[PDB]
């Protein structure tokens, strides 16, 4: 239920939001998802997970091909779903840039 | 509609409606001779899928969707195939048909069992209404074929035998594996996916065979605890039967690739459950393999 | 301000009220009992606003709305501020209610016209319903609502038969319930519980149940004919709120959230409360 409350009606403000010289917030939204269930993680992440990849990409740095394209070809499909609901499509843009 | 545009007829047959049009056959007599050629159908010498061909009888959907909308082959400038075919067929829209049906089988207005099939033939999620009541072994099925269609996608992608034309409605080209799909069962069915035929299920797949004969020597350590001797192995005795069995196989084909010593511990368990019943003849035949 | 209110709703938090008036306007009002802030202003429609319905917290607080247009133009707070997030229009012939479903029914959109039609689609945000309607009445449908609660199917497959039960009240003196079926073409009809001899004007079906499930139909030979249906899933039986004609031209009769409580709205503006008396027949408490 609670993957519905940002992904159908308010985007993350922790990347949105976030300051992007030191990406603070941004880090906040990847360590509260240490602190949700992981021991469960493949039955409730299919919006949440996008970020969760986007997240270890950029932050961590984990710069594989491999990685770079799971996550391409996913969010192609997640874009088109949500570039048309509020906040969420503001976001995408973003994810881009970066 | 025919029947009435405001107050008219009140016939479901034709002349009794309009007197300008012919009584077609119908009914109960469509019915008999629709059973008179599923008879002949299964003869051939391949009875079990002529049976089954011949019951998908009527509706062309019934037959004509399993009869194939398939690839384009073409056996003129294609040799390789030249004596496997002596015709062109497959429809060369083929990839644009696939996302066309995956729209159609989303939607209700049809069974759901029959639109959990229709999603599934393009390379999709069956419909929600099945997909909530599916165990382990039809979950599992499903993400099998997504991989297969994935990594196929991706390879004529590139030769560009498949393009824009094609897509109605994207599909990914992302890479997977099947550790990922294990993670994805186990998450969503998690007391089956520890049931103990299907452990040894998921290992072969990966190819984690030597692997899993030493981590069975290490619980047979572990067994001098009390929650252990009591429980853990006595909860599968069936599954310790193909464990030994196999040991010896892997042995035999490389002792390398798992100890001697593990496939020895192991014996030792299989030897408890003769010992169980008060057999002492079979013993000799495993100790060779010690 | 208005001199005459029609009709008037509650949110789903308590905060909020739309008062459906008659000069076109849904007045989005916050409530404070009598008083209420004016926040908010729709005009947009044409003649009478006949109902207004707020969403069940889960799918959004949006406020469809119907008049005498026939269509339902769905209303929705997009930045803190009103605007049209939907149309309809399947059925035009004046859509005279417009409810949204319980929680566990989804977000389930009831339409129901005067031309015996009656629509049930879903809300998206990504779009896509698939029409599904289903004849109920034939000289029309002048108010619906939403069946009791959803049931469980047990087996290896939960929700078979029943499931979400629409309930309607057309203009032929008729009133029913359905049962969701997907082996029959059309929602096969229960049972026509004639009692009638005037036009059906208001249905609601009790959120408290003991033994048996309780509807009101509200007529305008100015009776309440209350269904009890013995023991939930029998037959429904005759039980009358009173046997005689009031000298009151009744209009609405909603139950209230815990208890058998019903009101029943009065031709000469009094709203008598009724409780069930000391055998099955009821007496007032008001």
């Not at chain 2, 996302?99 to 069992?113: K, W």
């Not at chain 3, 997009?78 to 229009?89: D, K, L, M, T, Y």
């Not at chain 3, 009151?248 to 058998?260: E, Q």
Request: hydrophobic content about 40%; charged content about 25%; glycine content about 6%.
């Amino acid at each position: 239920l609670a993957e519905m409350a940002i992904v159908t009606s308010l985007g993350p403000r922790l990347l949105l939001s976030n300051n992007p010289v030191q990406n603070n917030e941004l880090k906040t939204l990847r360590e509260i998802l240490n602190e949700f269930p992981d021991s469960e993680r493949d039955k409730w992440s299919v919006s949440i997970n996008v970020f969760e990849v986007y997240l270890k990409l950029v932050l961590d740095n984990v710069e594989t091909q491999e990685t770079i394209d799971s996550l391409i070809s996913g969010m192609k499909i997640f874009y088109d779903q949500y570039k048309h609901c509020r906040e969420v499509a503001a976001c995408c843009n973003v994810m881009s840039q970066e | 509609s025919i029947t009435s545009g405001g107050l008219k007829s009140c016939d479901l047959d034709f002349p009794l409606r309009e007197n300008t049009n012919v009584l077609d056959v119908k009914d109960k007599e469509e019915d008999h001779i629709f059973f008179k050629y599923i008879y002949e159908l299964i003869l051939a010498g391949a009875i079990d899928e002529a049976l089954e061909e011949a019951k998908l009888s009527d509706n062309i959907s019934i037959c004509m969707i399993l009869c194939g909308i398939q690839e384009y082959l073409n056996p003129v400038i294609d040799t390789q195939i030249a004596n496997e075919f002596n015709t062109q067929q497959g429809i060369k829209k083929h990839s644009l048909w696939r996302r066309t049906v995956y729209s159609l089988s989303q939607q209700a207005g049809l069974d759901p069992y029959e639109r959990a099939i229709y999603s599934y033939l393009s390379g999709a999620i069956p419909n929600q209404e099945v997909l909530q009541y599916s165990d382990w072994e039809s979950d599992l099925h499903i993400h099998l074929n997504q991989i297969l269609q994935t990594e196929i996608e991706n390879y004529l992608l590139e030769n560009n035998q498949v393009g824009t034309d094609e897509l109605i409605l994207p599909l990914p080209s992302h890479a997977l594996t099947v550790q990922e799909v294990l993670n994805r069962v186990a998450s969503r069915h998690p007391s089956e996916s520890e049931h103990p035929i299907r452990v040894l299920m998921a290992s072969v797949i990966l190819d984690s065979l030597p692997s899993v004969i030493h981590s069975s020597v290490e619980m047979l350590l572990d067994v001098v605890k009390g929650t252990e001797a009591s429980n853990d192995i006595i909860d599968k005795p069936y599954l310790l039967r193909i464990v030994t069995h196999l040991a010896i196989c892997l042995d035999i084909i490389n002792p390398g690739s798992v100890e001697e010593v593990d496939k020895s511990k192991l014996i030792t368990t299989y030897i408890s459950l003769l010992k169980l019943q008060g057999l002492y003849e079979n013993i000799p035949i495993y100790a060779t393999f010690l | 301000h208005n001199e005459l209110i029609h009709d008037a709703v509650l949110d789903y938090y308590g905060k909020r009220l739309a008062t459906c008036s008659s000069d076109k306007t849904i007045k989005i009002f916050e409530v404070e009992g009598e008083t209420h802030k004016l926040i908010d202003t729709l005009t947009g429609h044409e003649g009478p606003v006949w109902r207004v319905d707020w969403a069940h917290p889960k799918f959004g607080t949006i406020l469809a709305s119907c008049s005498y247009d026939g269509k339902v133009l769905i209303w929705k707070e997009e930045n803190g501020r009103w605007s049209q997030i939907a149309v309809h229009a399947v059925h035009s012939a004046s859509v005279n209610s417009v409810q949204w479903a319980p929680h566990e029914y989804g977000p389930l959109l009831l339409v129901a016209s005067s031309d015996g039609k009656v629509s049930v689609v879903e809300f998206k945000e990504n779009g896509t319903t698939s029409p599904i309607i289903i004849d109920a009445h034939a000289i029309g449908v002048n108010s619906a609502s939403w069946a009791p609660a959803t049931i469980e199917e047990d087996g290896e497959h939960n929700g078979t038969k029943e499931s979400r039960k629409f309930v309607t009240g057309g203009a032929d003196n008729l009133v029913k319930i359905w049962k969701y079926n997907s082996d029959a073409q059309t929602y096969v009809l229960e049972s026509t519980l004639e009692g009638h001899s005037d036009w059906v004007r208001d249905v609601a079906w009790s959120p408290t149940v003991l033994l048996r499930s309780y509807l009101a139909s509200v007529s305008q030979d100015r009776t309440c004919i209350i269904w009890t249906q013995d023991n939930e899933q029998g037959p429904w039986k005759k039980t009358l709120l009173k046997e005689e004609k009031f000298p009151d031209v009744l209009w609405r009769a909603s139950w209230s959230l815990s208890g058998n409580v019903l009101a029943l709205s009065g031709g000469d503006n009094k709203v008598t409360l009724w409780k069930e008396n000391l055998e099955g027949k009821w007496e007032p408490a008001g």
